[PDB]
A paper describes a structure:
AMPARs associated with TARP γ8 are enriched in the hippocampus, and are targets of emerging anti-epileptic drugs. Modulator selectivity for TARP-γ8 is determined by two residues unique to γ8, Val176 and Gly209, in the M3 and M4 helices.
Resolutions of the ion channel/TARP sector at ∼3.0 Å, with the LY-481 structure reaching 2.6 Å, enabled an unprecedented view of the modulator binding site with associated lipids and putative water molecules. By contrast, the two larger NAMs reach towards Glu520 at the lipid-solvent interface, and force the Tyr519 side chain towards Asp515 in the pre-M1 helix. Notably, a putative H-bond between Tyr519 and Asp515 is also apparent in our high-resolution LY-481 structure. The fluorophenyl group of JNJ-059 projects towards the acyl chain of a lipid (L1), which is also engaged by the distal hydroxy-ethyloxy portion of LY-481, close to its (currently unresolved) head-group. L1 is also contacted by the displaced Met523 side chain in all three NAM structures, while the neighbouring lipid (L2) reorients around the dynamic Tyr519 side in response to LY-481 and JNJ-059. For example, in the LY-481 structure, the pocket extends from the oxindole carbonyl toward Ser128 at the kink of the γ8 M2 helix. This region is highly electropositive and accessible to water, with putative water molecules coordinated by the Ser128 side chain.
Residue numbers in the entry:
A (entry chain B), B (entry chain D): 395 to 549, 570 to 819
C (entry chain A), D (entry chain C): 388 to 547, 565 to 773, 778 to 815
E (entry chain J), F (entry chain I): 16 to 53, 77 to 186, 196 to 234
Write the structure that this text describes.
Amino acid sequence: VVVTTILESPYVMMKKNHEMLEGNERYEGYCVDLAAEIAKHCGFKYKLTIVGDGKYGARDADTKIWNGMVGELVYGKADIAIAPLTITLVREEVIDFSKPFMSLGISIMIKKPQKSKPGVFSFLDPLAYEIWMCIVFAYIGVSVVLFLVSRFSPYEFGIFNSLWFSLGAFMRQGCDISPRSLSGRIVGGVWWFFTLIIISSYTANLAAFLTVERMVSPIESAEDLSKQTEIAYGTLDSGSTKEFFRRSKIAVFDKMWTYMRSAEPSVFVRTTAEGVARVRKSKGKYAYLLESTMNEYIEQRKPCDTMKVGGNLDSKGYGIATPKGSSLGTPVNLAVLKLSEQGVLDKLKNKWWYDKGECGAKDSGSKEKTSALSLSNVAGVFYILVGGLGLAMLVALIEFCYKSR
Amino acid sequence: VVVTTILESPYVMMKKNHEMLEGNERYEGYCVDLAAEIAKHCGFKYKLTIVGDGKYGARDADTKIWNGMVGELVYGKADIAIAPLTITLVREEVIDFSKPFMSLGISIMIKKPQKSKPGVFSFLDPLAYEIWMCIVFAYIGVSVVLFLVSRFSPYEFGIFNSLWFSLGAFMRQGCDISPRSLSGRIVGGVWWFFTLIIISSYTANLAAFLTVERMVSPIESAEDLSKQTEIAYGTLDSGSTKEFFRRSKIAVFDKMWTYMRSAEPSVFVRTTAEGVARVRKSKGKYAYLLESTMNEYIEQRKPCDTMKVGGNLDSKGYGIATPKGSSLGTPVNLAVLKLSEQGVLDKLKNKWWYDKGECGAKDSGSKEKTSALSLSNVAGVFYILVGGLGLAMLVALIEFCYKSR
Amino acid sequence: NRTYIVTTILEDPYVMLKKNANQFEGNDRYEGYCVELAAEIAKHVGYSYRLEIVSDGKYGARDPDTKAWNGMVGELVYGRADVAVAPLTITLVREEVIDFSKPFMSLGISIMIKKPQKSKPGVFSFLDPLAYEIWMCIVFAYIGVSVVLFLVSRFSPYEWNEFGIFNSLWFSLGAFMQQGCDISPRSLSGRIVGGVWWFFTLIIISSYTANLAAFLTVERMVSPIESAEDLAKQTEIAYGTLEAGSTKEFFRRSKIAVFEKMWTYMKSAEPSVFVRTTEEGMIRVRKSKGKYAYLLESTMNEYIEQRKPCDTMKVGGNLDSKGYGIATPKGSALRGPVNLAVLKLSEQGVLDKLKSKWWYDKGECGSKDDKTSALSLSNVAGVFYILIGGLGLAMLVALIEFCYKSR
Amino acid sequence: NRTYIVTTILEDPYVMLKKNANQFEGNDRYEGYCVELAAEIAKHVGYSYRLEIVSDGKYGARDPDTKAWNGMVGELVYGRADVAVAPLTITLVREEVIDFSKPFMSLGISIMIKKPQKSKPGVFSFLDPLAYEIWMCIVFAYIGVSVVLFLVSRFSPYEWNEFGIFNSLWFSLGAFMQQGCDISPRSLSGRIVGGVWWFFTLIIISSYTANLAAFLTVERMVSPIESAEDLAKQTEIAYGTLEAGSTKEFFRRSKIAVFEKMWTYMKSAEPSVFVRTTEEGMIRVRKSKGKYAYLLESTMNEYIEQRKPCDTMKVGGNLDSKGYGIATPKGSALRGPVNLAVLKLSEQGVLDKLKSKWWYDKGECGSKDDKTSALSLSNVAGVFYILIGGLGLAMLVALIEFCYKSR
Amino acid sequence: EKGVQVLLTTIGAFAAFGLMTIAISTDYWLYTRALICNDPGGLTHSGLWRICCLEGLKRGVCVKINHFPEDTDYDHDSAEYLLRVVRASSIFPILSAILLLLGGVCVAASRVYKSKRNIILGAGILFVAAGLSNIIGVIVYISANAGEKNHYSYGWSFYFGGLSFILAEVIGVLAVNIYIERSREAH
Amino acid sequence: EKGVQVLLTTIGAFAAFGLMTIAISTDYWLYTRALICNDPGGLTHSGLWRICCLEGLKRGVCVKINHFPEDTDYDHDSAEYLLRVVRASSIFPILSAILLLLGGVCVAASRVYKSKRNIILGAGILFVAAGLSNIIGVIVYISANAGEKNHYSYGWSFYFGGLSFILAEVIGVLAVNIYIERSREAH
Ligand SMILES: O=c1[nH]c2cc(C(F)(F)F)c(N3CCOCC3)cc2n(CP(=O)(O)O)c1=O
Ligand SMILES: CCCCCCCCCCCCCCCC(=O)O
């Protein structure tokens, strides 16, 4: 028996030193160890054989011939095919698959989130915008209440000086006048407490922000990726993923197909390497759609700047093939079932993907040596300051010109 | 063949379900599995035979007779031993040991450090005492310099008001007077910058202290342990540890022996359980000297509040013994080395010490929900405040009386 | 040219008795995922089917001594039923005696935890950094400081000053908030009092800011397990499993380190983490408030997550991979057609549509779907309420001051 | 009734040529741990010994094809030498062909890292939380704010105020330090300027405090590896090993997960973490500044840690357990007496005394021996220096003001 | 009015003294679980001197508190020994009560010897000192209750002590103002 | 003296203008490694308009800076597009130089038309506005250099711009004081 295969890492890849003592060790991969295990279980000798035509088994409409590993099996060139061959209806009508040895589906690859460049007005981040607006409203209200109280029940505190007192209190600067009546003093004391709490909270939450980094993915599913339009989609220009979107009746994938067809420039790529590169380039504006196993493989390969997000959109399985009427299908099926029950396939999956992993674990590192704050972190407050200075100049000139008349 | 053995966890313990279906599995432990594994290589049948006495072999001076599992081996009652029996000269002169299957020594057991109750004046912790003294010196110096500058080169600032200005500046309270001259203003500016930096540093380091707890062991060796005397030293009343200290000529252990003989009450315990209990209840004021294996075992036992520190003060080994002249001696000697090279002994060590650890890893939980500050954390500043109020009252009355006359 | 007997089991949503059971009879009395799947399979194969239930009410299994197959597997082997449209897991032993189809569902062992609810921070949570004892002792120390200042500033006849009791209260309050007032003590006694009060306020306010920072930093570094390894390493959370089932099989016969450790912890525990039934595990997870994690089939976890109450969530990926399939007896004529129909339905999206319908569309929760750590108005609401109340009290007191002075 | 030839190897401190090699000959030419150990063994056994060095300069080993033992083991097997007093590890293959004694030293694989030095915090490290760009832009914004305030407060003829340029500078400086001055603006323009400056200062100072807190908190949660597992999990630190030796044997033939992972990382690396010689590994550790961890015998690690330079530290416990022993030929008469002598010396403490003498007493570092995280005067020294300089400059300026006004 | 001011001062002094004595001698300061009466423990209302559990067969049984359940250097171990000694003695609450009594005595004696006005000043000083002793006492009490999530609550003796502090400060203010009025009148 | 004050104002205006023009047109603002000239890159002294690398065969070769090495919404992408546009245009340094020139023109014209005193006020306003534009310019420059441990340093054009700011503020103060003296004299 000769086991047909195909070149697609990490399933089949040339050995580190294949020229020397090539034998059967010129090839290594997940499929190779799998073939070893199932030949041991089936009690047969196996000699590997790459397929002449790289294209995975398919059937031409006009010719009606099968080109690939399927062609090799159906036409007697090979007995068995141990490769990531997807189980499909048309492909089963001619050969007998086994029970899946790995289950997979369509999944989303995104650029790994990284510290984004701080934006002007990021100094407001520790507090929610609603707190800021309520702070402004409270400033107006406290100034107005103090003015009313001072005017109606005097023991100095006009609206202008009332606003000045409140602002100086909020900034921990003190004023040149303080209330002398019980009501004004109640107002002042309560405003003072408010300012103390609010400023302590701002400083504390800023310390929290600067101590621990916590990045959040823009998307976590296809639905989330479906509704928005900021990020762009992407599939191989010819494959099962594009067909699945093309033929789908589920609303989300119908919308996805609509966007992918309409969108210009074209989102489709010619090769998966092109897709991963485009993902790595767009700095988080590109999301590729591909098979889950490849996505995990890449995620565990350097430069380690991509991740899989969400659950698989579809369900599919990879199964060992065999031509109709053969004798190896029945034992290899029970073989794969036995391996799954024992834990062998899980062990190989962990050992080829996670172990042998150029990248690290999920928690590769933490508690990064914090960096000094940069001007870009506080540039907005500089801009605000300079604008206020210009506004003060303008106001003064306006007053001077008015008094000149 | 019958393997002699002793009851000592985790080497021998009664099986969980020995009452029903005892079979040969009534006894389980590290040494039972070891005996099985070695008899595998030796090619002999083994039936466990716990010597009736629980004592590890020893020889009586008057009788000149051997009692224990050593007595069982020497007198022919047994064909082999597997229990943890240290390799020593006297026992080797009558029986033949194997190469050690675990190496150990004398070690220290201390209660695991825990958060101590905060002391009054713990609010000074974030800053070193030298910073506080230099702060006081800087306050005096800046007040004096401002006073001199205001008197010699005036443009209000006596020594009293100079000190008041400096204190109000350090506490972020302002003052009723500010300098008008360039020199006084230079003094004020540098003092202001100093205060800003120092208070920000205090708050920041306090936040650091309160967000990550960091417990440090008082002792990390036997030298450091011997130098101090706040903690007491425990050794079983009769054992090899006590005799080692008695016979020792190394300076540190001579000091330790002197201490233990002189110290009152008795630091010795009659049993190991007593020593571990004294460690667990003495709130970190007891350190028990025992064997490293037992210490490591206990470190993964509930309530899991004790730990081993430092290295080992001696070198000893446990070796499976045979009666002199036996054919088993050489095969077991080769078997122990075989297992050591393969990793079986390490596997069993992890199996019976770390696995089945009632405790967890080095850190099962971290960054617990931080607790609100308690009055005991800030009670010293309350005491200082009340004392200052009393001092103010006293000073006022003194001035009143003096100005009366 | 006959009706085929389709065995089945009662398990939501796969098959379950319809609400109007009395009204309907035959195949029409049942509803679920697998009845409609059987309908589609029959349509694709063109065979008339009579639906029935397994008497044993359980899935296939072999008695050790008797060597007799029970449940649907027994029905198929002994000729009682022709097809088995149900969540019958594909296994080595079963596949030997019956002919499975290709999977119509992929699943595995998965984790089930108490849902992280949207906690209400609490009005007056801005006091949490300091114990209420500190706050109240602060109030009483404020009163004492004010009184002592007034005394040491006004008792001496030679001064009779500006430091009355009201202005002493005002000075002390402004000192605490680090907002000076128009007056400062000029005597040594008053200045001693002011100095100690100033030191007190500095320490207290720095402590408040620092402990609030600690609170928020710690709340910002909390990470849920999100996986089995995270679940395994920690021991705070107790994670159970059904005493009898393929899950215990998987964990006992597991060579992988983490699953072996999980078994070690499960067997070595008290009270027994394990439960007799799945309803028991679900209620235990719901009651224990995050202290319990239940390991079970992914499909049931998803269904439960969609049932009312909505207080449970699935985390992580499936630990192992399995599959449900339609089974027929060895040598049957429906094996090939059934497998082709299953694949036809899978490609067409029929199975995904049925899954969505019977898991989500019928879902009571009916909700497939903002981490910022920025403080919200709920975190600081109490201080706003205090502000409003103080302004109201101030207007009221001004009104009183106006009514007074009527003469 | 004859002299016994004791083979040996050159390895510090076990055996090494004395400084006055020319003056001395024979046994007296050598000094070290094992020469004195052999002296003690001979005394306990009462035999006269002539010491010799192994010609091969290497420890025993068997050629695969030739099946010939090399080194000291070869000398013993072939009758060249009677005893082998040296750091000859106890192994299965050797023990078959020679008779080992009980160990006189216990050791294992251990971790060797760049010593954590007492870092100097740095004068003017109190500016680290903010970039120098922020500080300098603050200075220039201060100048600009002062000038604009002076302008908008004094240009109008109708006022000619108290806001001259000097007092504007003073007001701005006090605003930045959150210390008000005796004057506040009364116009709308001056008040706008003051408000924006106040906001700026609030944000900047809160940022300084917060980032300093972050710095110190992060410096307070840093944990050195202290173990192999900590070393294994992280990938920042590269950990090597000698290309040829029992260490590589141990890591390749290791069923344990962490050692297998260590081998996986070591083989899969570029540039090759491994080194040709141990001196190479030591120098690489010293140069790489914490990026390298060397795995080697514990005894050599300790000796190196005690040699000059003192920039290397051993961390963790020994990974595996081995032992050195005195070896003799099979059937020799010295096996029993030698084993008894070794045990005698171990109980008497002779071996521990020799270890301390030749590892620590002769140690260049000669130092067997306060984590607080509290800030030290070195952390805030620059601000003290600024204070002193400002006081001096103030004295000088007062002197100038005094010389001026001479008329 | 001067007369009503003195009357309020005296009434407040006597009320504060009574409140403080009641607080000292009632045993309802703290509510908590102890385990001294039948794992978590049994509900019990502790006090300043004795602890009284109210669950089980030991209902209404009041057993003395010891204040020394561990081993420490009797001569001088650390600040904890001093804290426990002060908490056991309760010299600060007792001192506050004593000072309030003396202040009331001085206030009453001011009615006679009406020429002397420093009596009222002494009374005010005593009242203020009593308030300070009360504050120290409560701080000591709360600090000494810290073991090292057990729910606890405070009873009416605690709040009686608080009322005593408040009234003491009030009557000290009144006495100082009275002394000021007297001195100004003589001028 | 009024005359020397005006002379200092004019000299300072011209010096500030010259310093700012030189800073704009010298290309020694920043020293760093770029990789636009031959992994870490080659030493190069950048500027405000062009970057000139000084290592390798491309010695003394000054190539223009682009300010747009990525893809962004030309119409309105975000604040980064506006920042890069302002940095590329360098309208703020140029505006500061223009305003300094106009202020000097006004100061010189004040010598004639000596009756009018608002000319000096306009000059001071222009100087202060020039300082503010300089500050905005440097903030923009520094912010736009942030990539997202490469050592960098600043050259003498940078510090010339700083000197220009300082002198502009100084001469603005002098002009305002001159206007004040003139107005007071007419009173
Ligand atoms: O049988 C089939 N097995 C396949 C296996 C893989 C992989 F699993 F990686 F080996 C891949 N792609 C190659 C890299 O880009 C993404 C996935 C395509 C496969 N296709 C073509 P499809 O029809 O478009 O799915 C088949 O037909
Ligand atoms: C970093 C900037 C600080 C520079 C401080 C230098 C002091 C300059 C003071 C100039 C005052 C001369 C004018 C006095 C008041 C006036 O005429 O308006």
